[PDB]
Design a protein around this ligand. Structure first.
Ligand SMILES: [Mg+2]
Ligand SMILES: [Mg+2]
Ligand SMILES: [Mg+2]
Ligand SMILES: [Mg+2]
Ligand SMILES: [Mg+2]
Length: 1312
RNA sequence: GACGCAUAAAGAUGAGACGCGUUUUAGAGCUAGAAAUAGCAAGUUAAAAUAAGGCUAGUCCGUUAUCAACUUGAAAAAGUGGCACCGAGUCGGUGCUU
DNA sequence: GCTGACGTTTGTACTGTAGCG
DNA sequence: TCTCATCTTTATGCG
DNA sequence: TACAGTACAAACGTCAG
């Protein structure tokens, strides 16, 4: 009667296996529905459900924010048009209509075809006078004439459309900073108190050297105008009031409280951004762009003359062929400037007079475009200065730009603050803003319509956890003083001490804990036990010596926020006071909640009577982040109604009982537990309601559906035991501590081994090293990874994190794939690894970092990947590590959901009866089981290995449970300790083996029949149970099912493709015919439908009846589902039989002659649908012939298994016979099978390892799913893609229940 | 014998932005030709769109998640498939039983 | 007369190709 | 790619 | 890995003798 279930859950699979108490997998004669003659089927209850992995929300969000940016950009353009509109209608009743109809063709345009001036002649005298937008911008700035509104609009609209980044706080301005005479003002100012630096690469290393060549009064002065100095101590040689000085990031008023800094800092930074002020202008960016254009002009004039006078045969390939990455491909084709440079540098090396061009290419100046990937370095304030200059000229002639100058000034610089979010009116699930009035939001009225404070508080409050114990209560800040006290008293209530006189160790009394906290947790940020035993036990308790226990040599707990508030609020008795504790809690809550200084000031204003303004100025810089696991109500709001204390009171003092948070909230004697359990629907609603990524919701829901379907199979009786394989681990304590070493020590060891003084120049703390940019800065020893340039620790936003292998090629967000680099160097390696030249020029420095172990060997391999520079689809053959985290999350959730679904009956004696015992095995047990008794696992043959893992999980779990029911609490849900646990869980499996072998060669014979002790019952018969599991491993029928999935997402490929007279292009906008305008291509089919209809066919048209697949794209899907028959008639189908329309999602399964199966991948592609049931002997041979020298066993055990391969050399040929018979049966790639046979015969003499480690690849020919390329040694086999779908229209369609047990089979031959 | 403390790795969710890129159009091509084009000149920029679109019309929403088939149902949701044994190349046979 | 010659006029294999920092 | 914020899982140390 | 670009092979009229 009884049965059990095993589950193996992966990112793309769940394996499931019902087992009997005998460890046999059962089978039933299942009824099958549908029109076919077949009425019942024999099926084993072992299988695997296969589904494609769920996508994370990343791509959808990166499209959503882009959609918002384009909407807002067009609205900026519209407010500009609104200001310009009554005036533009004077000079041009249709200019905005012409910029709008710019995209259309000449006869589609209602107005004359030239966008800006309309007429041809003025549009060309225009482009002759101003060849780009920047000659326009410059002429507008430096000249003082009355100028054309249509061109003001274009200059402003261009700057408003492409406005540059906002990563610089406040503003830069050129007008205070154009002229290098500021050093005279600086020395004149210090007496009250060229390009000399900038001619070389900017860092302190050059700046000090130059100024000493030209103590403190010059260089130490000027760095405070130029650099974010590292010491926190006060300055020297300084003003009459003495404090620290640096060019601080957010607010230089934090340093001025000790003008020329603004002038000189803007001058140096703008002259670092722009190669300007060797010439005097008022429009520096436009001047630089015009200099680029003129240099490009003279360079091309030189270049073509050189090419014609020395290599005239070469010209067309460079300058006309737009496919070659020549200049034609650089301009008219798709080539970048890197591709053009590597194209053109060999040609320049052999010509004469090219030295200047070769010099310019090495600086990246050679024939630059004006708009490039590195324009993301340009801040918006430069554009802001140009727009201000423009308006300040024109206002003398345009009264209306005088009247509303600041509205246009507002429109470019307005950015929605990130804490406010999308400006909805209630219908956006992403919106959290609250608006004061129902008025429409503009950049001008934004401050009076939107309540920024409430929205900014709600921004955090929507995201921070509810307390897991009190789900209606939001958690504390991490740094809240209540949480500090909670943490220290939670830790210190459980430490124990003993002296020479005492019989046994004793807890700290409440007096002692209070004394320790006030003594040293309030006078040291982190306390060592050395500090505890000296400063408390030796100094207060006067002990000669003491042993302390319950804590490592450094305490985990801290009162660091007390130290902060003590440095700020000077009255220590204020911080130790009871009355003001709520106010201090509000201060730290605000200071965690808000980072914008104005709302910090506006929130803290209510307490300005308790502290001075100097303290308040100190409080508003003390930014905090992070939130505790617990709510205020939990830790000090609720009281046990019998005793009267809160949790924090108990942690402060609990007599000698000294309970911590756990034993408190689990003691029935304290009504905390009653408060918890009174503070504490369908499957799909529950699965939607969980937190975390949407990606994991797929694998959880499908396996819960699988388990419920299995329960439906077994007469609605529940299983005794459910075994879930967990992606969980045990380690030795030394390995696990090494696996989690503090990341400061990683830096210190490597820096000491390479011997640099960077930590003397830039000291840093492990709390600070949690920042990703800063961690990378120290890992790289202060230098860029792509040019030999000293990085700046203050400017780490203009440096950016390159992913060494790009995310578009491979998802890898690890430190081994991250590089901090200058933004231009990162964006100059779009979709690639670093180039060959950069590997050649820096492989030595990378080797110095590798030898010093700041980078891994994997990181060195990714950096030097151009030495192996494939980046092919065949290089994907290692798992992305995201699949492990998803597996862990899914299996963790499914444990608690299946426990909640199975064990539902509450009881008053004990709370919940285990009707079903849900089990969560770590994978090491099943892995050791597989490797000990030669039940090996090869992932490349076929998909049955998922079901075999579930079978072995159920077998091993039930065997361990029935062998050790005393050890039920180690598996059922609800030298170092870790090393002892690791050896215990290693040795717990010894009951499966007949012999136990010691390291000295001793052997112990174990019984052939295993039993438990406490009831003597048989569990593991090493005679017949191993034979039984070997029988179940050799079944040829396993219910593999691929989930039928309607596709969602992008309508097409994203690339927009040029116009052509082909009807397959997707119309990219409703009125834009793609024969004229181009459009998208590669559409994605949501599902096929089987259509049966007439069609008008033949050159003399006549109705022919037809049955075929129609691929409903995602775009057209809703129109189809509104009303099918008119959609089919629009597609051209006539007399359609409505009831015979069959919906066919992706991977709809069909079966054909000789057992052949095909999965419908679209209306015009199939996929191979059968699975090779290869016998176990050849599988274990393939695993042992693979892995041949790298087996983990002893040399004797390696040898005997390596000989097992040699004993079965003839297995190689019979595997090829197996693959031939199968491929002929199901795959039908006869040319590929002949190529496979011929290549095999080409290499039948090569080593049996290399043969097997390539026969393992031939199963790509046979394996289920999409045809994919594979290779056998040198020979590469191209995929035999099943682009024909003609056959499935008369196959039998198989609709599979989610396990694959029940079926509906439709014989489509009878349909038509 | 699943929880908050410290550490670390790998990931995730949301907001605000930047740079590109593509597409069509605009930037008069010229000269020589029966010619298809060839020589030569040119090129660097801009507008518009950037999922088709949608109705609550917002400076909002539109690529995540949910889906075998069939009977009920607006949908949520509920419902629908005998067992034992001997065998095994993707499931077969045998016997009870409804 | 009526088999087949000779174009047009559709229907099948093979290589490319895909938004990204 | 940037800025800002929050959160999950797993592993080790202390209860 | 599904579809796109595109080089390649059967089928369907009017001549052709
Ligand atoms: Mg597994
Ligand atoms: Mg999806
Ligand atoms: Mg990059
Ligand atoms: Mg698996
Ligand atoms: Mg721990």
């Amino acid at each position: 009667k009884k049965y059990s279930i095993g589950l193996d859950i992966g990112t793309n699979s769940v394996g499931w296996a019902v087992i009997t108490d005998e460890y046999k997998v059962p089978s039933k004669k299942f009824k099958v529905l549908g029109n076919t003659d077949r009425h019942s089927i024999k099926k084993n209850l072992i299988g695997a459900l296969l589904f494609d992995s769920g996508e994370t929300a990343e791509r959808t969000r990166l499209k959503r924010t882009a959609r918002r940016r384009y909407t807002r950009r067009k609205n900026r353009i519209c407010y500009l048009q609104e200001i310009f509109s009554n005036e533009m209608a004077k000079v041009d009743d249709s200019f905005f209509h012409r910029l709008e109809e710019s995209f259309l063709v000449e006869e589609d345009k209602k107005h004359e075809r030239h966008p800006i001036f309309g007429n041809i002649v003025d549009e060309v005298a225009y482009h002759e006078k101003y060849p780009t937008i920047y000659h326009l911008r410059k002429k507008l700035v430096d000249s003082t004439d009355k100028a054309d509104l249509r061109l003001i609009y274009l200059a402003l609209a261009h700057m408003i459309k492409f406005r540059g980044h906002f990563l610089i706080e406040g503003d830069l301005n050129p007008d205070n900073s154009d002229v290098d005479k500021l050093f005279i003002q600086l020395v004149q100012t210090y007496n009250q108190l060229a390009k000399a630096i900038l001619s070389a690469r900017l860092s302190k290393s050059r700046r000090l050297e130059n100024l000493i060549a030209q103590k403190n009064g010059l260089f130490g002065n000027l760095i405070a105008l130029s650099l974010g100095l590292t010491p926190n101590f006060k300055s020297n040689f300084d003003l009459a009031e003495d404090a620290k000085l640096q060019l601080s990031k957010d607010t230089y008023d934090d340093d001025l409280d000790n003008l020329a800094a603004k002038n000189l800092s803007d001058a140096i930074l703008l002259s670092d951004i722009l190669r300007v002020n060797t010439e005097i202008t008022k429009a520096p960016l436009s001047a630089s762009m015009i200099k680029r254009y003129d240099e490009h002009h003279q360079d091309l004039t030189l270049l073509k003359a050189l090419v014609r006078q020395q290599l005239p045969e070469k010209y067309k390939e460079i300058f006309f062929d737009q496919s070659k990455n020549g200049y034609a491909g650089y301009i008219d084709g798709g080539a970048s400037q890197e591709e053009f440079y590597k194209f053109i540098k060999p040609i320049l090396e052999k010509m004469d007079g090219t030295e200047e061009l070769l010099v310019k290419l090495n600086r990246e100046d050679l024939l630059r475009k004006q708009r490039t990937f590195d324009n993301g370095s340009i801040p918006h304030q430069i554009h802001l200065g140009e727009l201000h200059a423009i308006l300040r000229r024109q206002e003398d002639f345009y009264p209306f730009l005088k009247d509303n100058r600041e509205k246009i000034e507002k429109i470019l610089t307005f950015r929605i603050p990130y804490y406010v979010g999308p400006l909805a009116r209630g219908n956006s699930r992403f919106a959290w803003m609250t608006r004061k009035s129902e008025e429409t939001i503009t950049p001008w009225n934004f401050e009076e319509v939107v309540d920024k404070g409430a929205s900014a508080q709600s921004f955090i409050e929507r995201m921070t956890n509810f307390d897991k114990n009190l789900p209606n209560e939001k958690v504390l800040p991490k740094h809240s003083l209540l949480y500090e006290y909670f943490t220290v008293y939670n830790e210190l209530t459980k430490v124990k001490y003993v002296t020479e006189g005492m019989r046994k160790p004793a807890f700290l009394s409440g007096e002692q804990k209070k004394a320790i906290v006030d003594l040293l947790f309030k006078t040291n940020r982190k306390v060592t036990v050395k500090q505890l035993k000296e400063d408390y036990f030796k100094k207060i308790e006067c002990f000669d010596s003491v042993e302390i226990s319950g804590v490592e040599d450094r305490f985990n707990a801290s009162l660091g926020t007390y130290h902060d508030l003590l440095k700020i609020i000077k009255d220590k008795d204020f911080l130790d006071n009871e009355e003001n504790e709520d106010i201090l809690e509000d201060i730290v809550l605000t200071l965690t909640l808000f980072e914008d200084r104005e709302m910090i000031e506006e929130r803290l204003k209510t307490y300005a009577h308790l502290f001075d303004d100097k303290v308040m100025k100190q409080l508003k810089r003390r930014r905090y982040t992070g939130w505790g696991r617990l709510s205020r109500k939990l830790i000090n709001g609720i009281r046990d109604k019998q005793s009267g204390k809160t949790i924090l009171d108990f942690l402060k003092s609990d007599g000698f009982a000294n309970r911590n948070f756990m034993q408190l909230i689990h003691d029935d004697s304290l009504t905390f537990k009653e408060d918890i359990q009174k503070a504490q629907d369908s499957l799909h609603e529950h699965i939607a309601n969980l937190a975390g990524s949407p990606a994991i919701k797929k694998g959880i829901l499908q396996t819960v559906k699988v388990v419920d379907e299995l329960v439906k199979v077994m007469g609605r009786h529940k299983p005794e035991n459910i075994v879930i394989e967990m992606a969980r681990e045990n380690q030795t304590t030394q390995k696990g501590q090494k696996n989690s070493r503090e990341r400061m020590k990683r830096i210190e060891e490597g820096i000491k081994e390479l011997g640099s003084q960077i930590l003397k120049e830039h000291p840093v703390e492990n709390t600070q090293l949690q920042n990703e940019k800063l961690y990378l800065y120290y890992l790289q020893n202060g230098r860029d990874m792509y040019v030999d340039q000293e990085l700046d620790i203050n400017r780490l936003s203009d440096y950016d994190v390159d992913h060494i292998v790009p995310q578009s090629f491979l998802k890898d967000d690890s430190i081994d794939n991250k590089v901090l680099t200058r933004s231009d160097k990162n964006r100059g390696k779009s979709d690639n690894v670093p180039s060959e030249e950069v590997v050649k020029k820096m492989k030595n420095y990378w080797r110095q970092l590798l030898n010093a172990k700041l980078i891994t060997q994997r990181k060195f391999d990714n950096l030097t990947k151009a030495e192996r520079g494939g980046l092919s689809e065949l290089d994907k053959a290692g798992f992305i590590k995201r699949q492990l985290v998803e597996t862990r999350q899914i299996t963790k959730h499914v444990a608690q959901i299946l426990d909640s679904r199975m064990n539902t009956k509450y009881d008053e004696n004990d709370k919940l009866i285990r009707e079903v015992k849900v089990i969560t095995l770590k994978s090491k047990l099943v892995s050791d089981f597989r490797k000990d008794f030669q039940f090996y696992k090869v992932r490349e043959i076929n998909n049955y290995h998922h079901a075999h893992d579930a079978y072995l999980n159920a077998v091993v779990g039930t065997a361990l449970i029935k062998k050790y029911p005393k050890l039920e609490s180690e598996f059922v849900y609800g030298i170092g300790k870790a090393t002892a646990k690791y050896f215990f869980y290693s040795n717990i499996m010894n009951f499966f083996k007949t012999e136990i072998t010691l390291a000295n060669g001793e052997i112990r014979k174990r019984p052939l029949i295993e039993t438990n002790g406490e009831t003597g019952e048989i569990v593991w018969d090493k005679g017949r149970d191993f034979a039984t599991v070997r029988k179940v491993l050799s079944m040829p029928q396993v219910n593999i099912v691929k989930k039928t999935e309607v596709q969602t997402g992008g309508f097409s490929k994203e690339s927009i493709r040029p116009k052509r007279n082909s009807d397959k292009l997707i119309a990219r906008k409703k009125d834009w015919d793609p024969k004229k305008y181009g459009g998208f291509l590669w559409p994605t089919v949501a599902y096929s439908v089987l259509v049966v209809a007439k069609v008008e066919k033949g050159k003399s048209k006549k109705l022919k009846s037809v049955k075929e697949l129609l691929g409903i794209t995602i775009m057209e899907r809703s129109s189809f589902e509104k009303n099918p028959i008119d959609f089919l008639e629009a597609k051209g189908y006539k007399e359609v039989k409505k009831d015979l329309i069959i919906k066919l999602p992706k991977y709809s399964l069909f079966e054909l002659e000789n057992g052949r199966k095909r999965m419908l991948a679209s209306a015009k592609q199939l996929q191979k649908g059968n699975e090779l049931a290869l016998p176990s002997k050849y599988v274990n041979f393939l695993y042992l012939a693979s892995h041949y020298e790298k087996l983990k066993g002893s040399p004797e055990d390696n040898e005997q298994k390596q000989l097992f391969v040699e004993q079965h050399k003839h297995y190689l040929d019979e595997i090829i016979e197996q693959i031939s018979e199968f491929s002929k049966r199901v795959i039908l790639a006869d040319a590929n099978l002949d190529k496979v046979l011929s290549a095999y015969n080409k290499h039948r003499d090569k080593p049996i390892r290399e043969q097997a480690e390539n026969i393992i690849h031939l199963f790509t020919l046979t394996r289920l799913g999409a045809p994919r390329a594979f290779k056998y040694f040198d020979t590469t086999i191209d995929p035999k893609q099943y682009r024909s779908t003609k056959e499935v229209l008369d196959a039998t369609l198989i609709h599979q229940s989610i396990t694959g047990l029940y079926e509906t089979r439709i014989d489509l031959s009878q349909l038509g």
